[PDB]
Each structure stands twice: as C-alpha cells, then as structure tokens.
Design a protein around this ligand. Structure first.
Ligand SMILES: CC(C)(C)NC(=O)[C@@H](c1cccnc1)N(C(=O)c1ccco1)c1ccc(C(C)(C)C)cc1
Ligand SMILES: CC(C)(C)NC(=O)[C@@H](c1cccnc1)N(C(=O)c1ccco1)c1ccc(C(C)(C)C)cc1
Lengths: 305, 305
C-alpha cells in the first residue's frame, strides 16, 4: 500500500549523460550510438541571446569548437549539424552504454521522469508532466540545460524531453529529441509567456482511484452526474474537458474499484465546489493531476523494469 | 528555479538488486561483495508468521535452500547466517557492480531515496523520510520486501534502510543493513501500532526557506518570536521541538535568504494558527516536512554525484 510520486530507475539514462562546452558555455548532452544531442543555444553568447541567428552563428563554429566529455574522457567530434533547436555532434566512438531507445513526442497531460544533470553528471531524478500549456514545473538550475525526460518500457528508454529554458514565471520549456519545442516557445531571451495552465482532469480522476485503492474513501459521495454536466463545472474551474476516451482510459481502475467513472466525476465535482474542508487525500491537501491512469496502474500493481 | 521532491540517481543501487527465494516465498536481496542481504522472514511460512521462532526455523534450512538470482544467473550460496532481523547469504562470486558503500543508521527526521523492487528488478525510485515515530510512508506492494533506502555522497552509497513490513495503518517498517529495526517493531504478524507521528519542524523551516528562494514569499509576516514561545505553539500542533542545533543547521539558508531563523519561526507560527487560507507554497497546500536543510541546499545549489 502507499502512493508516492515515483520515477523510473535512472541507471540506463545515467550512462548516456556527457558534458558539452562551446566557447564559455557548458551544458549537458545525450550520447546515443555515435551522436551527442544538446541544445543549440550552447553556441550563443550572453550578448547574442537577445536575437540569435543560429544559422549565421553556427557558420563560425567548426568540429573542434565543440568540447564533449564523457566522464573524464574526451570524445572527438567529427561532424556537427543542426536539427530544429538541437545540435547533433557526431563522435568517433559509439556509446558502449547505449540502451535500446526511441524518440517520441508525448502529448500534453502525459508524464515522464527527469534526470537533472550538471556538467554531464546526474544530480537527481523526479517525475514531471507536460502541462496543458506545454510547460513543465521542473527543478532546474543554471547549466541544467541538456537534461532529458524519459519513460521506460521494460528495457527500452523512450526519450521525450530535453531541457532548454526557464520561463519568466519560473516554469520550464524544452524540445523533443528531434529539436521541436513543446509549445510556442523559442530559444531566445525575449518576453515569452505560457497560456492558462488547466488541470489535467483525467489524471486527477486516476489519482482519486489511487486514493480509493489505498483506503482514502471519505470523499466518495452519494451522487452521480452526466459527462456534459460534469464538464460544465470542470471548465469553470479551469479543468480539462473529459472525453469518452478518458472514460475508457480509466476503465481498468473503474473495474478494479467497482466505482463507475461518472460516480467518481460526481465526487470530484463536489470536491471542486466545496473544497476539502482541511482534510487530505493520499497525504495531499490539493487535487494532484500529475499521475496518468497508467502511472496509477503501474504503482498499484508493481510493474518492474 | 523550481522545487520538486527529488531522489538520488539509482544506477549504483540497481546493480546490486537480486532475487531471493526460500521455499515458496520470494523477495529482494542486496548483493555487495560476496554477501547477499535480505530480510530473515523469507524463511517463514504463512502459518509460522503469527509467532516465528527464527532460531528454530533457520535450523531446518541449509545453504541450498536459498535461491538467489542476479538477472537470470544463479549464485551459489556457500554460507548463511543471521544478524538481527536480516539474513546474510555468502555467495562464491563478488558483485562486479559493487560500488563504494557504507552501512549507516540514520536519525528520525532524516531522508533517503527508496528503490522499490519486485523479484530483484527495480520498478521505481522515490524520496522518503524517517518519521519521528520510526515508520516511513513508502509505496510498497507485496514482494517489495528487501528493497533498500539510501543516500549518495558523490561516489559512495550509504545504505540506511531495508524494507520488511507494512503496518496495519498503511505505513511501513524495516531495519538498517545490520538488521536492527527502526522503532519498536518486530517481524511477526501481530497487533503493532506506531506512536504519534509528529511534524519534523526543522524540515518544514527548510522548506519555507526553499519557498522564499523560489519566489513564494506571501507567508512572510512582520513579527518575530522566541525559541521557547515558538515551541509552545509547535508542541500543541504536534510539531517537533526546535533546538539551537536546528537553528545552526538552518544557518546557511538564513544567511542566503537574509531572514533570521526566529523570524521564519514566527511566519510558521502564524501559518499553524491561521492556516493557509486556500493559498499554496511551492505548489503544495500543506506544510511539507520531508526535506532536510541539506536537501534544500543540494537542490537549490546543484550538487551532482
Ligand atoms: C531565464 C533565463 C534568463 C533565460 N535564464 C536561463 O534560462 C538559464 C536557466 C536557469 C534555470 C533553469 N534552466 C535554464 N540558462 C542556463 O542556465 C544555461 C544556458 C546554457 C547552459 O545553461 C539559459 C537557457 C537558454 C538561453 C538562450 C536565451 C540562449 C536560449 C540563455 C540562458
Ligand atoms: C501487512 C501484512 C499482512 C503483514 N502483509 C505484508 O507485510 C506483506 C507486505 C505488503 C505491502 C508492503 N510490504 C510488505 N508482506 C510481503 O509482501 C512479503 C513477504 C515476503 C515477501 O514479500 C509480508 C512482510 C512480513 C511478514 C512476516 C509476518 C513474516 C514478518 C509477512 C508478509
């Protein structure tokens, strides 16, 4: 029993973390096969980051300008190119610790583990979700750029995030491993703001099914509701609209707990309208939305990797 | 910027996780050098766990009754002994992935990372604290016994916990790597209850210093208080008494933020007496106490391993 915010084992990712320096700027890179992936803004200078022209800046850089370090071993960069907002440095040696991996672009509301790194060395791992406004509420300090977020499927690592920027509000922005930013953000020092950060409703529901599975049932009320009526209250509290797919995604937890999805929606509705009256659910005083239906199943079943 | 509940990279611990079976009971073991550590209750049967006499039960077991599996490779048990509530199976091969390690018994209020495992395979990692009642609020399912909690010091792993039991309330109990239970709990199926779970006050203070460092300052009031007066309110809300050592431990955060410790105590006092009025601190609606002063420094500075 018990429900903690939990991340994948990071061993497989640790073996791919290297350091990348260009000029005076140092950050983290991802070393898979004979290619190192890192954010392109490594080539910028503090003055050039107001309006960087990466095409022109990259022209002044040669292979020998990119300093890559795996542990204390230097890698020979024999090629460099730019794919969207990420650099690809080709090295002479393939990473012997390269695991089975894949590059996937996740959807807003999905989760992943982040291995925060500094100078190509891991410092910690935690769990994030892709907010509906395409930011993440990470824990990143300077130099954390180049750290990656990932999911694990038994033996295969699915990379989905690489950190780039911190937004003025304190949130964080980045791209997938193909260099495409999640959201409308760009790698420049300019006024950028994220939209409204709604609540991932389906994730909250899975969290409530998690609570019921762990003994917290005080919030289970006696009503039920309609998917349309529930939505009328969700979209007033800045909640994501629930779809039939969400109801289907939640089916497994509905069958395990024996509580129809629409009944839990009614419980959630009364929680939103009346608050929690100072009580707690799974040790939290807020409605957590950073657990997907799959994460709940994984943690309440025991899926190992 | 940003503050998430974060754990150490688990790669070094992953390479020590093996599976241990005795009879029909399977659980996890820790493989360091040529010894495997696992809870002694692996030798119990479902009937014998009401009042297990481990001395007599262990007498009926030989080396070849303990089945240890590292990956899909079997290890030859050439010796077995009992140290407190943990078994030590001596194997013929030393663990090639054995890192620099140490066995430490942590103090209540301290934190550590847990690598939840099932059948000798890691499933996830999260951060825990040793509650003042000597339980932990883990996420453990059946078979999770034998998983370990640890801290990392650059390159040295300090093991401090090994999971044994789930208590009737839903909390969890275990021992250090020498087999000594944290708290007054015993490895039997009997009526056991933990005492009052107080709040680790010093950890809450470091969390508030963490918030101030991340931009959340709304709770900073205009008063100050005395260490004795603050305690009179803490011990009414079931908070740990603050000592001068706690004030000294918090010195670094007090100097960084420029807020004397006793002033933050006054802020905490008004939060306890009046609640948070539906606001949040670092994304939480409750006062978090599972971050030590050291964890806050590590996360707000960038200490890598
Ligand atoms: C908020 C801002 C002023 C832009 N500071 C940062 O983004 C920090 C940073 C700080 C904390 C977490 N992640 C990045 N930041 C860095 O820390 C950094 C840059 C290179 C290695 O580490 C950073 C990220 C992107 C840029 C440009 C404008 C060139 C794309 C410049 C600096
Ligand atoms: C609450 C209780 C009825 C005792 N169930 C468990 O403790 C589960 C268990 C379940 C969830 C998390 N950790 C342990 N539990 C186990 O899951 C387990 C035992 C062996 C391998 O996995 C367990 C722990 C200790 C004992 C004795 C009494 C022999 C010391 C028996 C079973």
């Amino acid at each position: 029993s018990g429900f903690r915010k939990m991340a994948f084992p990071s061993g497989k990712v640790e073996g791919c973390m290297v350091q990348v320096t260009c000029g005076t700027t140092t950050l983290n890179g991802l070393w898979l096969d004979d290619v190192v992936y890192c954010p392109r803004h490594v080539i910028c200078t503090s003055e050039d980051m107001l309006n960087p022209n990466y095409e022109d800046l990259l022209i002044r850089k040669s292979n020998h300008n990119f300093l890559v370090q795996a542990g204390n071993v230097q890698l020979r960069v024999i090629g460099h190119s730019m794919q969207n907002c990420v650099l690809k440095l080709k090295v002479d040696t393939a990473n012997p610790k390269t695991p089975k991996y894949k590059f996937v672009r996740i959807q807003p509301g999905q989760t992943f583990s982040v291995l925060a790194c500094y100078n190509g060395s891991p410092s910690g791992v935690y769990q994030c979700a892709m907010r509906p406004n395409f930011t993440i509420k990470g824990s990143f300090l300077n130099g954390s750029c180049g750290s990656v977020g990932f999911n694990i499927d038994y033996d295969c690592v699915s990379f989905c995030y690489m950190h780039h920027m911190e937004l003025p509000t304190g949130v964080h922005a980045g791209t997938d491993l193909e260099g495409n930013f999640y959201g409308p953000f760009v790698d420049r020092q300019t006024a950028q703001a994220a939209g409204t950060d709604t609540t991932i409703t389906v994730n909250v529901l899975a969290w409530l099914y998690a609570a019921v599975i762990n003994g917290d049932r005080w919030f289970l009320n006696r009503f039920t509701t309609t998917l349309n009526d529930f939505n009328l209250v969700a979209m007033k509290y800045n909640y994501e609209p629930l779809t039939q797919d969400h109801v289907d995604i939640l089916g497994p937890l509905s069958a395990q707990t024996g509580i129809a999805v629409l009944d839990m929606c009614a419980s959630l509705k009364e929680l939103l309208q009346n608050g929690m009256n100072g009580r707690t659910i799974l040790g939290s005083a807020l409605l957590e939305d950073e657990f997907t239906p799959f994460d709940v199943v994984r943690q309440c079943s025991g899926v190992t990797f």
